[PDB]
Design an enzyme around this catalytic site. Structure first.
Site: not given
Length: 276
Positions: A176, A210-211, A213, A215-216, A254
């Site tokens: 997380d 991701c949540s 779109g 850093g990940r 990010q």
């Protein structure tokens, strides 16, 4: 500078050099990327009519690279270049309840065969459901140790096709806070997805989210591009891949930690290869 290519036979020492002095020179490099893409506006995403369509009101597609729905035309999604193409990825947010039909419409209209989630807008079981003008049916759900693979059948308004099998790859072990605990984990996930992309008769662009779109999502994409570079060429350009991504969407890679992790991935691949 838009590019910082490193010959592979030099990478290991260059990365040690970057890391010296608590990351003195890595940090300077990462900072040169700060402003990339940031000259671009997100006026359409800011229209009053679109407010409910953004999960996070501060994480918006650039007008210049946004994906359009057939005629509003708005979805929070951006086209990205890869190793291979033009429109090779679509980066998007996790759909909201009120934008899941829009999400699936985009996936249909854009000829998308693969979706990557690194963070539910699909059916819970194998019974079919409408999402707007599209019908969706889950054919399989395979829970593996570090990701889950689902297969869906989708049908929308016929253009280039009339029905389609879609694979959805959900990476389920990203901490997380911070980056994955091993380079091996994300490397293997990326290689697996890339194999599934490559072996299709025609995959279209790959959706990644991701949540938001961010850093990940950017880290997944950069690593996909970078591992393809390592399979093809005798230099690697992490800086260039990240620069290119940032041109197309905000927050593509990010954090500095994500930038380090990408360097560690390349380091680890090259160590293992030298030996075989």
């Amino acid at each position: 500078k838009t590019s910082c290519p490193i010959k592979i036979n030099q990478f290991e020492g260059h990365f040690m050099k970057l890391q010296a002095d608590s990351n003195y020179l890595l940090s300077k490099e990462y900072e040169e990327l700060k402003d990339v893409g940031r000259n671009q506006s997100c006026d359409i995403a800011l229209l009053p009519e679109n407010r409910g369509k953004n999960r996070y009101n501060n994480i918006l597609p650039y007008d210049a690279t946004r994906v359009k729905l057939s005629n509003s035309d708005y979805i929070n999604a951006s086209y990205i270049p890869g190793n291979n193409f033009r429109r090779e990825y679509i980066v998007t947010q996790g759909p909201l309840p009120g934008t899941k039909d829009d999400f699936w419409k985009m996936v249909w209209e854009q000829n998308v065969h693969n979706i990557v989630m690194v963070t539910h807008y699909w059916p819970a079981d194998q019974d079919s459901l409408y999402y707007g003008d599209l019908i969706l049916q889950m054919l399989s759900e395979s829970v593996l140790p570090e990701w889950t693979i689902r297969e869906f059948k989708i049908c929308g308004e016929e253009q280039l096709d009339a029905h389609r099998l879609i694979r959805h790859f959900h990476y389920t072990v990203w901490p997380d806070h911070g980056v994955p605990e091993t380079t091996q984990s994300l490397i293997q996930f990326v290689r697996t997805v890339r194999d599934y992309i490559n072996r299709s008769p025609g995959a279209g662009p790959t959706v990644v989210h991701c949540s938001a779109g961010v850093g990940r999502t950017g880290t997944f994409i950069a690593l996909d591009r970078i591992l393809q570079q390592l399979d093809s060429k005798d230099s690697v350009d992490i800086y260039g891949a990240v620069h290119d991504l940032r041109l197309h969407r905000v927050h593509m890679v990010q954090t500095e930690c994500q930038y380090v992790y990408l360097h560690q991935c390349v380091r680890d691949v090259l160590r293992a290869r030298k030996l075989r």
